[PDB]
Design a protein around this ligand. Structure first.
Ligand code: CU
Ligand code: CU
Ligand code: CU
Ligand code: CU
Ligand code: CU
Ligand code: CU
Lengths: 334, 334, 334
């Protein structure tokens, strides 16, 4: 078809765990959605003791933003690489087709620009990440990854063909950092990434992470940044992982509907206490809360969650329901 | 509803891999089942060379007991913490709802008691484990975990809606121990857990286990403790893992029906040679034997199974069936 | 039944990633297919810097050959152990039944022979591997593993009951090597396996691989050995893993139909960007290409793929389709 006869929309993205405005049901025919992402290389502090790394990011955040479109639409991305950066970057969509998902067409040196249009033909959640030849793990484990959701034209549908509507939608990306440390057990610091490259390769070859974080920082979704909800509300959590397997868990709740691979053509699973999301993919979980309070959202490899920092929080407002769970006898001292 | 108008039952649990008496089909309406578990901190020897650790357990066993109830019943647990113990414990069900699955209501110091009632609303196998704030991985990888099964009111059903009945039911919990060892490669010994806490944290941060055991000891399900069966019998094996992914395998047999996540609302899978059970969940496998002999039950990460101790045995009585598998020519020396 | 009244066929296998001739639809009734595999212990060079190991193989290749049969057929294997070898070997099928999948009947010392007949009763892809008592991980991680496919009698069927036909079929086995290295970081070399056994056990207990390779060598499916195809062709990739979990990914394409556990009785999944294959099992992926060019086939634990060698290539002939993905603006220097 002649795409020049299709409408065009302009969308400017938000910083996670929030998503830009959208509509769960298509109001029009296929359009051409337009995004604009900027690359940024900056130092980050990821834990409490001020460990710093040289992160590379889309729009200056770990992870990148979530782009929501509809099926059979046209995505047109405008990737910009400013001059103060120093490396060659290129994007790669798991939703595109051919040319390494768009990686062979998007190579940009410092101080350059590129546009790319592709068609979103399959519904579901997908992952995008940088991919320069010879430095793929380094770029992707420094923080250059994100997700993209391609809704069906009629919104979600459970396994019985009945519709599904979510009041809120949150996005969580789990990032594993392999920071190199010396013989003294202290993390080493550098000037610019090129110096840290080789000991980064060594640390990665050790094959175990040093940090695992939600939203690029230990505690970034804890305290005053907790994710909020109300009893009876319907929430969709998208969870992405670009390099390592992860197993999300909502301490207190469950998974009402779960796409553990994130592809909406398949029927979902029901009543999941803990599902598995392979490395390099995204998944979706639909849950509607029943009791108020504070929920935890962890990676149920409990060592990673409570020693490397893969834990966030949920604050849900409401009042108790003492039929589901009550304390018959308060903790008593005999 | 007014629960005071519901029957009450008293159940006393057994030591695994055996389950207390129950009925796969509900004979009455919803009841209130009553369990009573006691906490015990004791030294354990987990391998052949007498490596000892400071295990913490429910009812003095690793893992804890399996509690079988029916859907939409009321579970009332009475947790007791004696005075000779020295830590603060609290239980946490993945089947409950709200208050961290019951963890915020069950904190008991040494020499205390607590009751808690909740409603079992979802059918399937779930995991329960200790969870004190700040020592969750330590408590859960010292041995404070177990499972709980919530049958449907009509018993199991395959993917074609036909019933399913098991003659035997066994329960297996896989436990990974990170015992700290010194520079000499020898495992270190202590007085009480508080001393071992910090090197335990270090060993856990190494992120690889030192032992992996079925029923809390290397060889605990081998030799005279092998699990017994007969040709044509129907067995349901429940398998639980609270912290690490595992992949069960029955060398010689298969999986006739498999709930790899352990939720009975979903249809099962068929003819599984090896399924995956994520960390922090339980799964169920229904198998009916055909040939007699000795079967192995391993974790098919063969290194873990045959070097760290994740292997058990099955003794099935009967006589051969030389149509399925025969030796046309005996091993001959040319 | 009396098998002596059934036809007999003779099949001689090929070296992977190619499969011997077969027919996706059964032309006759059940037969007795006859294979003959020879054991070979030889030195291998697995990477670019000439690291050598003492591999043990079926027919002198890593992995072994793929055997394609039909359901309810009779497989008759003739395993031969020559005299220049020095160890005791025995085969073990995950598709057989009883006697450890055939491991208790097939023990052969150097200079011996054995035949074994079993019935292929379940359709799907299965794994076979050596299994001598006490050296199972060593034998299986030195390279003694392969796969076997048991097609249904009517060929494959998608989830809507419609047939499925593949023009090409490729087979890929992922092998993880734990080569022992000294204090200097250099890989140690030996004379014969018996010497290397103990440091091999130590290296395996470290629990992280040193190499991960497709077809037993770094780059073995890259360059002039790339897997070939044409736009619009239909390919079935079988992927096997005997010891460790793996997550295949086709950079640029997708998975049109995926049996992630490899059992054809279950319905497949659709539009998989990355599926998970547990350790000790095989899986199947049906894909039909749309755009030409060079595709990568990686294990999407990107560190393993691009640092340990788990990557292969696809060359597909044809011409572009600028409706699916086009470059609106060539990379421009502002
Ligand atoms: Cu980059
Ligand atoms: Cu990728
Ligand atoms: Cu405890
Ligand atoms: Cu838990
Ligand atoms: Cu062998
Ligand atoms: Cu096996």
């Amino acid at each position: 078809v002649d795409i020049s006869t299709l409408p065009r929309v302009k969308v400017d993205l938000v910083k996670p765990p929030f998503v830009h405005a959208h509509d769960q049901v298509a109001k029009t025919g296929p359009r051409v959605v337009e995004f604009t992402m900027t690359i940024e290389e900056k130092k980050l502090v990821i834990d409490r003791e001020g460990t710093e790394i040289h992160a590379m990011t889309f729009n200056g955040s770990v992870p990148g933003p979530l782009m929501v479109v509809h099926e059979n639409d046209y995505v047109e991305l405008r990737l910009i690489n400013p001059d103060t950066n120093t490396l060659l970057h290129n994007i790669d969509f798991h939703a595109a087709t051919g040319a390494l998902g768009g990686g062979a067409l998007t190579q940009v040196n410092p101080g350059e620009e590129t546009t790319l249009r592709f068609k979103a033909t399959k519904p579901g959640v997908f992952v995008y990440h940088c991919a320069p030849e010879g430095m793929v793990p380094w770029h992707v484990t420094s923080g250059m990854n994100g997700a993209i959701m391609v809704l069906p034209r009629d919104g979600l549908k459970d396994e019985k063909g009945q519709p599904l509507t979510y009041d809120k939608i949150y996005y969580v990306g789990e990032q594993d950092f392999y920071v190199p440390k010396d013989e003294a057990g202290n993390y080493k610091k550098y000037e610019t990434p090129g110096e840290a490259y080789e000991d980064a390769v060594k640390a990665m070859r050790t094959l175990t992470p040093t940090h695992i974080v939600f939203n690029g920082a230990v505690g970034a979704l804890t305290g005053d940044h907790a994710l909020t909800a109300a009893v009876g509300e319907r929430v969709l959590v998208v969870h992405s992982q670009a390099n390592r397997d992860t197993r999300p868990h909502l301490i207190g709740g469950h998974g009402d509907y779960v796409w553990a691979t994130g592809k909406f053509r398949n029927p979902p699973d029901l009543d999941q206490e803990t599902w598995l999301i392979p490395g390099g993919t995204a998944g979706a979980a639909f849950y509607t809360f029943r009791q108020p309070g504070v929920y935890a959202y962890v990676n149920h490899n409990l060592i990673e969650a409570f020693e490397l920092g893969a834990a966030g929080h949920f604050k849900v407002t409401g009042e108790w329901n003492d039929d589901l769970m009550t304390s018959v006898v308060k903790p008593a001292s005999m």
